[PDB]
Amino acid sequence: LAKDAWEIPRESLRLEVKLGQGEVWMGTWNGTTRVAIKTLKPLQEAQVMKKLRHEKLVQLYAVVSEEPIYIVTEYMSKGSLLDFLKGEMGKYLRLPQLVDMAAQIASGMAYVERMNYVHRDLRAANILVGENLVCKVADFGFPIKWTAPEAALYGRFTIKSDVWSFGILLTELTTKGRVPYPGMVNREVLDQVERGYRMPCPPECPESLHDLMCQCWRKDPEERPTFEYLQAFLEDYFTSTEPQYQPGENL
Numbered sequence: 001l002a003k004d005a006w007e008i009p010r011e012s013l014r015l016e017v018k019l020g021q022g023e024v025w026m027g028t029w030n031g032t033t034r035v036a037i038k039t040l041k042p043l044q045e046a047q048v049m050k051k052l053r054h055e056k057l058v059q060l061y062a063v064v065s066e067e068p069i070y071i072v073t074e075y076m077s078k079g080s081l082l083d084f085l086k087g088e089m090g091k092y093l094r095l096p097q098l099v100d101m102a103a104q105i106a107s108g109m110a111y112v113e114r115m116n117y118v119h120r121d122l123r124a125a126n127i128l129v130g131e132n133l134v135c136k137v138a139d140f141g142f143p144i145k146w147t148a149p150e151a152a153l154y155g156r157f158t159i160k161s162d163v164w165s166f167g168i169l170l171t172e173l174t175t176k177g178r179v180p181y182p183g184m185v186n187r188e189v190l191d192q193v194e195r196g197y198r199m200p201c202p203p204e205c206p207e208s209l210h211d212l213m214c215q216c217w218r219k220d221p222e223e224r225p226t227f228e229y230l231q232a233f234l235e236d237y238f239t240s241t242e243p244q245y246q247p248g249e250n251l
């Protein structure tokens with residue numbers, strides 16, 4: 001059956017270093033350019049990664065539509081935002097760098113918002129990092145803790161359930177990668193969050209950023225901010241919102 005212009009020769013790719021294991025390799029495409037190659041275990045409907053192109057989304061390069069199915073994309077030299085924040089770099093990141101990263105992610109998601117798509121698994125383990133603190137939304141391929149209640153309970157995934165996740169992602173950045181709802185197991189999160197619990201302000205995080213988290217965690221998904229609003233807020237943050245910001249111990 002008929003391929004499209006994304007298709008490339010099964011073996012026009014040189015796999016080298018293995019990076020994960022569902023498996024992910026670094027490689028070289030037509031001997032000239034470095035890529036990442038995610039391999040599946042037994043891309044049919046990648047009509048999602050094909051239609052999106054933006055500077056803050058990991059770019060699709062090519063596919064291979066036969067088992068084992070390949071997906072080739074740009075190489076992100078630092079790997080996942082989660083690993084980056086939990087590794088050696090986490091202790092040196094302060095609020096300006098973390099808010100900047102948040103802004104990049106909102107910029108990719110504001111594009112997703114315009115195109116009328118929905119990510120469904122926005123969390124730091126699905127943001128990829130390159131040099132110069134470039135972050136890019138990845139993996140449009142159970143993370144109850146990151147999912148809006150209406151989506152966890154009733155399968156209502158909208159751009160507004162993504163916003164909710166983006167708010168959890170903001171606690172990931174401000175805590176240098178901690179799992180959210182520390183001490184709570186999945187069921188206790190779901191019950192507590194339905195009764196109105198929200199994570200409190202993380203140590204040394206300014207109130208104005210916690211308020212932003214709180215708005216993304218509104219019960220009525222319609223009262224949650226847009227990513228366009230989020231991007232603009234984050235970009236202008238140290239002039240418009242926290243002009244007197246002082247670095248502290250950890251942020």
Ligand SMILES: Nc1nc2cnc(-c3ccccc3)cn2n1
Nearest residue numbers: 019036073074075076077078079
């Ligand atoms: N597109 C893409 N996908 C992945 C997955 N993992 C990495 C990576 C993982 C560890 C160290 C450096 C890079 C990098 N990329 N880049």
